[PDB]
Design an enzyme around this catalytic site. Structure first.
Site, mmCIF file in Angstrom:
data_model
loop_
_atom_site.group_PDB
_atom_site.id
_atom_site.type_symbol
_atom_site.label_atom_id
_atom_site.label_comp_id
_atom_site.label_asym_id
_atom_site.label_seq_id
_atom_site.Cartn_x
_atom_site.Cartn_y
_atom_site.Cartn_z
ATOM 1 N N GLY B 13 38.334 29.632 40.647
ATOM 2 C CA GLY B 13 38.635 30.315 39.405
ATOM 3 C C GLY B 13 40.040 30.866 39.438
ATOM 4 O O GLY B 13 40.694 30.926 40.487
ATOM 5 N N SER B 14 40.505 31.256 38.251
ATOM 6 C CA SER B 14 41.813 31.875 38.100
ATOM 7 C C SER B 14 41.796 32.784 36.883
ATOM 8 O O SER B 14 41.003 32.603 35.954
ATOM 9 C CB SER B 14 42.938 30.834 37.962
ATOM 10 N N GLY B 15 42.696 33.762 36.895
ATOM 11 C CA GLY B 15 42.805 34.683 35.775
ATOM 12 C C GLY B 15 43.829 35.749 36.076
ATOM 13 O O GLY B 15 44.744 35.543 36.890
ATOM 14 N N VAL B 20 41.884 31.513 42.982
ATOM 15 C CA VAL B 20 40.985 31.635 44.126
ATOM 16 C C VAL B 20 40.404 30.270 44.441
ATOM 17 O O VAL B 20 39.803 29.628 43.569
ATOM 18 C CB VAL B 20 39.861 32.655 43.864
ATOM 19 N N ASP B 96 28.176 34.656 40.358
ATOM 20 C CA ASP B 96 28.534 36.013 39.978
ATOM 21 C C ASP B 96 27.515 36.545 38.973
ATOM 22 O O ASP B 96 26.777 35.790 38.332
ATOM 23 C CB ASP B 96 29.978 36.113 39.442
ATOM 24 N N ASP B 135 37.218 48.808 38.181
ATOM 25 C CA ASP B 135 36.902 47.655 37.344
ATOM 26 C C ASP B 135 35.493 47.158 37.638
ATOM 27 O O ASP B 135 35.255 45.952 37.738
ATOM 28 C CB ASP B 135 37.935 46.537 37.526
HETATM 29 N N1 LIG Z 1 38.414 38.725 39.925
HETATM 30 N N2 LIG Z 1 38.146 37.766 40.925
HETATM 31 C C1 LIG Z 1 38.617 37.851 42.168
HETATM 32 O O1 LIG Z 1 39.349 38.762 42.559
HETATM 33 C C2 LIG Z 1 38.175 36.731 43.082
HETATM 34 S S1 LIG Z 1 37.886 37.294 44.766
HETATM 35 C C3 LIG Z 1 36.547 36.254 45.261
HETATM 36 C C4 LIG Z 1 36.016 36.361 46.536
HETATM 37 C C5 LIG Z 1 34.997 35.517 46.938
HETATM 38 C C6 LIG Z 1 34.517 34.576 46.058
HETATM 39 CL CL1 LIG Z 1 33.238 33.507 46.566
HETATM 40 C C7 LIG Z 1 35.019 34.463 44.780
HETATM 41 C C8 LIG Z 1 36.041 35.308 44.384
#
Ligand SMILES: NNC(=O)CSc1ccc(Cl)cc1
Lengths: 9, 273
Positions: B13-15, B20, B96, B135
């Site tokens: 994902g990204s944002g 990531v 999530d 958050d």
């Molecule tokens: N707002 N999102 C982030 O900061 C992504 S940190 C993250 C850590 C482990 C997994 Cl499996 C997925 C994401």
């Protein structure tokens, strides 16, 4: 209504 | 040597937080998540104990990553010319909490009780470590589906916890409290409790209660799903308009709706497996 994500900031 | 210690997989994902990737630690096949943040996009900076200037997110992650907890732990980090790279735990299998609630709808109160309890313990851990997340929302919570454990992610909007007023905020507005909307001022713990009230409503009703500023400050909580009177009471208490009218974390966890929580393993077996 629709459920949606909300970006931070 | 970042590129030789981890095998990089697909983008997860990204944002606003960065990008990531899924990854695997070459040393022992540990699943990891590899988060890249561009330096020019980093607003809040801090200093590690060593004194090296790092993103605040790294400062805060290090403060909460010692020992076991319900927080996704920072395993290592790297500095590149134009970016920082964070190596984070990756549960497997994982989903999530936002996607989980979209797919399942409103959660049974027994499941919401277990999830909400674990989030309270995770946030208490952060506060114990001197860290304010700022958050808390379903998007920033991961579910380890086999272990039934919840993990808090994304300290990119966080701060060191303090007892004085905060006048800055970069978290999610629909989870932010009415005193922020009205006055651009909030205190850390009572603002967190407000966001937890939003999160609990989200769990037992299937979506957040408020979308617009006028609803946030109006403080009228309409229940779109059947919810027990005990759960309604706790939500409405967390969403008190006056910050000093909100419960402490101790009062939340002593609330009658919160008693007899399932263990994480029981939660997975009954609700996730
Ligand atoms: N707002 N999102 C982030 O900061 C992504 S940190 C993250 C850590 C482990 C997994 Cl499996 C997925 C994401």
């Amino acid at each position: 209504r629709k459920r949606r994500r909300h970006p931070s900031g | 040597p970042l590129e030789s210690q981890y095998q990089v997989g697909p983008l997860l994902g990204s944002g606003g937080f960065g990008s990531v990737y899924s990854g695997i630690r070459v040393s022992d096949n540990l699943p990891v998540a590899i988060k890249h943040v561009e330096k020019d996009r980093i607003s809040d900076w801090g200093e590690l104990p060593n004194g090296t200037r790092v993103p605040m997110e790294v400062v805060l992650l290090k403060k909460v990553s010692s020992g076991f907890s319900g927080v996704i732990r920072l395993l290592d980090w790297f500095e590149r010319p134009d970016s920082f790279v964070l190596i984070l735990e990756r549960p497997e299998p994982v989903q999530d909490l936002f996607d989980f609630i979209t797919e399942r709808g409103a959660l049974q109160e027994e499941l919401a009780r277990s999830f909400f309890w674990q989030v309270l313990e995770a946030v208490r851990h952060c506060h114990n470590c001197g860290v304010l997340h700022r958050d808390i929302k379903d998007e920033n919570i991961l579910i380890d589906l086999n272990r039934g454990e919840l993990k808090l992610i994304d300290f990119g909007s966080g701060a060191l916890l303090k007892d004085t007023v905060y006048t800055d905020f970069d978290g999610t507005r629909v989870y932010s409290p009415p005193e922020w909307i009205r006055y651009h001022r909030y205190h850390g713990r009572s603002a967190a409790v407000w966001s937890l009230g939003i999160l609990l409503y989200d769990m037992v009703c299937g979506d957040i209660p408020f979308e617009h500023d006028e609803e946030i400050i109006g403080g009228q909580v309409f229940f779109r799903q059947r919810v027990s009177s005990e759960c309604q009471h706790l939500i409405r208490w967390c969403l008190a308009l006056r910050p000093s009218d909100r419960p402490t974390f101790e009062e939340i966890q002593n609330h009658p709706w919160m008693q007899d929580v399932l263990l994480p393993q029981e939660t997975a077996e009954i609700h996730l497996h």
